[PDB]
Write a protein that binds this ligand. Structure first.
Ligand SMILES: NC(=O)c1ccc[n+]([C@@H]2O[C@H](COP(=O)([O-])OP(=O)(O)OC[C@H]3O[C@@H](n4cnc5c(N)ncnc54)[C@H](OP(=O)(O)O)[C@@H]3O)[C@@H](O)[C@H]2O)c1
Ligand SMILES: NC(=O)c1ccc[n+]([C@@H]2O[C@H](COP(=O)([O-])OP(=O)(O)OC[C@H]3O[C@@H](n4cnc5c(N)ncnc54)[C@H](OP(=O)(O)O)[C@@H]3O)[C@@H](O)[C@H]2O)c1
Ligand SMILES: NC(=O)c1ccc[n+]([C@@H]2O[C@H](COP(=O)([O-])OP(=O)(O)OC[C@H]3O[C@@H](n4cnc5c(N)ncnc54)[C@H](OP(=O)(O)O)[C@@H]3O)[C@@H](O)[C@H]2O)c1
Ligand SMILES: NC(=O)c1ccc[n+]([C@@H]2O[C@H](COP(=O)([O-])OP(=O)(O)OC[C@H]3O[C@@H](n4cnc5c(N)ncnc54)[C@H](OP(=O)(O)O)[C@@H]3O)[C@@H](O)[C@H]2O)c1
Ligand SMILES: CCCCCCc1ccc(Oc2ccc([N+](=O)[O-])cc2)c(O)c1
Ligand SMILES: CCCCCCc1ccc(Oc2ccc([N+](=O)[O-])cc2)c(O)c1
Ligand SMILES: CCCCCCc1ccc(Oc2ccc([N+](=O)[O-])cc2)c(O)c1
Ligand SMILES: CCCCCCc1ccc(Oc2ccc([N+](=O)[O-])cc2)c(O)c1
Ligand SMILES: N[C@@H](CCC(=O)O)C(=O)O
Ligand SMILES: N[C@@H](CCC(=O)O)C(=O)O
Ligand SMILES: N[C@@H](CCC(=O)O)C(=O)O
Lengths: 254, 254, 254, 255
């Protein structure tokens, strides 16, 4: 029961977004939710999607995590509009198509730094800013993929960005631990989302989970959200710097 | 919420046992519990601690995991008395102090195989027998320690037993995943229990956790129980073959 | 260059044995080699395979690693016959087919402990006995497989023995380090040997390596010997508790 | 491991204490022809001096700042024209502002974080792309990392995230260049007293700890990194790619 808890959810694009998974779960559990989006199309979208939840009001803030100004000012406003928060769910990443579709060794500096910037550094600046609204502690969760731990064909620059995010989680966990802010990752399995269309080989990878993961099935947004509810609540007190694979056990087999 | 769920908890000895941590949490959550024990003295303790729980009746079985017949017959008896179950919490290990207190290179054969038998093989046979009571699926959690992942001074033959256990979780997760039985481990940080008393250097490790781990404090049995509630419930439905560290982040640092 | 170095090599059964690839590389680099075997038939294969070696003397010793007396007496006689040694190559494992070709959850107790005993404990006792012949330090290498790190379908009870063995290596490395004795693992890719004939689905794994491993080909016994050469020698002086994958990179992908 | 007729580019020597100069002494001793890249003229001057300790009949020295595509591209092309086809690269390059390093990790600047990624990780990707052109037949790329890439090590801060990137960069390059028979691997070196080591808060207290706690109860040195580099760069390690060999007295294996 997360009543009288407040969470910030970053990265809803549409009904299929992983973070809308996390949203439905936290909403059921009685949390108050604040949302951040990048472009005005995701906002309109968000307003329509919000009619599906028991949120008594719409708390929506624009934050492109490439802008410090936007992250700093975004969290300040949230603080003034909503008070201290209990946690942040980070569901944000980006890479060029031009770089995803080339050979990994053909990645451009610009593309490689862009993916680092949006997919890994954004968590550091978000963690620094969100800390200001968690004076009594809290919990921050980011969404990673198995390709940050292994080379997964086609995942290329994003995998190096996830490897980076996954260490970001460990260093934020160590840094923010004494302030009672826990930082953790969920490694989701493959899920059909807007961003997933930009990864070459996605369907083939869907099929191989079905055939090979211990549970012989794929996962969904809602199973990610249920694990997110654990990481964001007191149920996981004691757990920090952790990466929980929500992926039908595929991480455990070779 | 675990009303209408039944779990088996193996390996309460007294009030400081990790498994009694788990018991309190599950009981608070509405679960029906069944308890298994090896020594008479542990049943006496169980009978006393039950008075602190909401369990309307004692379901206690003697199962010494060195004996197939006891595991088979115990689980069969459980099925007759409470019907189908939804999972098992395994909190059992053992090694001769004469091995634990030696140089690892001096471990006796009989002592090494004794630690494997009780600390690891026991999970396999518990799972095979418990599966018959989970025709619809369920969840099995075993308790491990960091020493199965890295060589920790003084943990000696038990580290090799926990490495074995941790792989046993993985092979079971794979084997039983198609049956919808999830198998996971909790890697508990150090906690004062009766068994901790046989580990050379224990108190030293307690203090190195407070100083060095991200959260700057040790964990307790109830915090293991909250992560057990998570692994044992539908909250963790896409998670199998996993090892969740309940250790103040100590696992993520070096 | 290994002139005036003496290594013991355990586990040659025939010309296809991984340990015979080790033998060829070390024999070629100038090393003196001492060979241990179990079956009378491995001694005969050894007597015949010594002909294509530069070994001017056959030093063959019956050691079944199930017997403490055998390992203890055999190393004492080795020390008496060839003096102090520089290193041990461990290439020994065993499990019942009956346990191998079953679901892992059906593994017998006696099958589980047989595999732990020969495939892991053998290393702990060999290390202890061979430390006596390494007053100035040396190097000890064992052979593992990726299935000790992840649940590889059909590998079953041997995966759990290999996870055990890999912990054994780390715990020996920590214990024996102050004596300047280094202890490491080679994780070999799949290789057609006599023992590979007991693992189900070995041919389909061969195929999958070629299709998927970074190098798109399988490896061989010599390639293991070449890494054994490195680890047994001073080239690897700051390296212990390590697991080197000789597997075309397959460990590094998913 | 005899390396005549072999040629290795060695990036990142700044003085006699550099890890890369460990690598040099070893390969030079095993008969390798060696080519050396550097950023600051100061390091080139240092290279000219250290070359007198080596067996190298001629000095092959190239200025490559890995922040510039041009200098990496023209560097390697220029290399290929001077000495021909190469057998491998030892990448011994990293950087991050002290400014980001001696502060809280959560206080890391974007510019600083991206700088660390640029010099310490991305540089591997472009070096490999350009060095491939001189390896039509196969070879070996080795990069240098630190345990703080795998675990949050106190004070390593932004460099730890950069090393995680590097270690993944090794894995993705291995997969990609595997079928061209180029192996890509990392050495995870123990702490060593170098110029760069002076950037890291708490460096001396870690040296002490290794010596008290690491299996071998002593620290490692640059020649030890070199002997492993010689293994990774040679045919001794056919079969081995996408791997990270910890040359650190066993410290990685303990907790
Ligand atoms: N789907 C999968 O199979 C899978 C698996 C494992 C991990 N993940 C991870 O899960 C997370 C969510 O992705 P998804 O698959 O759920 O796809 P998604 O719905 O398309 O979400 C990606 C989100 O990132 C936001 N975003 C991108 N750049 C941003 C920026 N600079 N500033 C602010 N927001 C930005 C996008 O917002 P706008 O639309 O407003 O631009 C979008 O909401 C990502 O971290 C992804 O790497 C996904
Ligand atoms: N305390 C810690 O810091 C720590 C950390 C990580 C993991 N763990 C793990 O947690 C689990 C429980 O340990 P604990 O610390 O809670 O200590 P504990 O209270 O002493 O419990 C150990 C239990 O194991 C049972 N057991 C031993 N051999 C058995 C056998 N042959 N058959 C059936 N049961 C047997 C004991 O039963 P009887 O007394 O009836 O014989 C006892 O109830 C163990 O796996 C341990 O490795 C402990
Ligand atoms: N082939 C592969 O794909 C593969 C992959 C990864 C790791 N490995 C490992 O490589 C090592 C060698 O196996 P292999 O593949 O080379 O097959 P192998 O040629 O059949 O060698 C197996 C050896 O184990 C010895 N052995 C078994 N039980 C013993 C005992 N109780 N006492 C003493 N020696 C005993 C056998 O000796 P006898 O014949 O005299 O009984 C035989 O020499 C093993 O550890 C195996 O797990 C193999
Ligand atoms: N010492 C250790 O304890 C340790 C441990 C683990 C890993 N490492 C790694 O080992 C590698 C070598 O460092 P080291 O300890 O030997 O220190 P070092 O002697 O200071 O060498 C660092 C080298 O990096 C070069 N460099 C930095 N930025 C560059 C750029 N933009 N373009 C081209 N070259 C650049 C420097 O060249 P200039 O001086 O000419 O600019 C210098 O030669 C680094 O990757 C470091 O992260 C070191
Ligand atoms: C080789 C196939 C691997 C399957 C991929 C699993 C997965 C799917 C979508 C993922 O989310 C992404 C992917 C790309 C971008 N983008 O390019 O901007 C943003 C977010 C993901 O991380 C992870
Ligand atoms: C030197 C390591 C210090 C931390 C160890 C933490 C720990 C404490 C108790 C633990 O539980 C044990 C230990 C020993 C035995 N026994 O000898 O029978 C049974 C169960 C444990 O796994 C792990
Ligand atoms: C399903 C995985 C297929 C690849 C297996 C690679 C491999 C091959 C042989 C292997 O070596 C042995 C040695 C003995 C026994 N046995 O006695 O049953 C079994 C295996 C191995 O460990 C590992
Ligand atoms: C608390 C950690 C102590 C151990 C660190 C060992 C180590 C030493 C030097 C290291 O090399 C570096 C470090 C920093 C910079 N820089 O600030 O530009 C450049 C290269 C290193 O990676 C790694
Ligand atoms: N070395 C002491 C440490 C005390 C403790 O266990 O914490 C012992 O063996 O008892
Ligand atoms: N299926 C046979 C042969 C191996 C294969 O075809 O994969 C076995 O399990 O022994
Ligand atoms: N913290 C020291 C580094 C080495 C130490 O004294 O532990 C410094 O200010 O650079």
């Amino acid at each position: 029961n997360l009543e009288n808890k407040t969470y910030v959810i970053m990265g809803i694009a549409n009904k299929r977004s992983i973070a809308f998974g996390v949203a439905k779960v936290l909403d059921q559990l009685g949390a108050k939710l604040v949302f951040t989006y990048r472009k005005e199309r995701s906002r309109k979208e968000l307003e329509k999607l919000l009619e599906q939840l028991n949120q008594p009001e719409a708390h929506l803030y624009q934050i492109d995590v490439q802008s410090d100004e936007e992250v700093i000012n975004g969290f300040e406003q949230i603080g003034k509009d909503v008070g201290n928060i209990d946690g942040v769910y980070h569901s944000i990443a980006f890479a060029n198509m031009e770089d995803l579709r080339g050979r990994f060794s053909e990645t451009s500096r610009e593309g490689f730094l862009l993916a680092q910037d949006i997919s890994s550094y954004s968590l550091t600046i978000v963690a620094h800013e969100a800390k200001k609204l968690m004076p009594e502690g809290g919990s921050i969760v980011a969404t990673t993929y198995l390709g940050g731990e292994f080379a997964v064909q086609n995942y290329n620059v994003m995998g190096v960005a996830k490897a980076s995010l996954e260490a970001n989680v460990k260093y934020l966990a160590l840094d923010l631990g004494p302030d009672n802010i826990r930082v953790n990752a969920i490694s989701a399995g493959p899920i059909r989302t807007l961003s997933a269309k930009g990864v070459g080989g996605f369907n083939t990878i869907l099929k191989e989970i079905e055939e090979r993961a211990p549970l012989k099935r794929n996962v969904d947004q809602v199973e990610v959200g249920k694990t997110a509810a654990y990481l964001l609540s007191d149920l996981s007190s004691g757990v920090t710097g952790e990466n929980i694979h929500v992926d039908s056990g595929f991480h455990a087999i070779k």
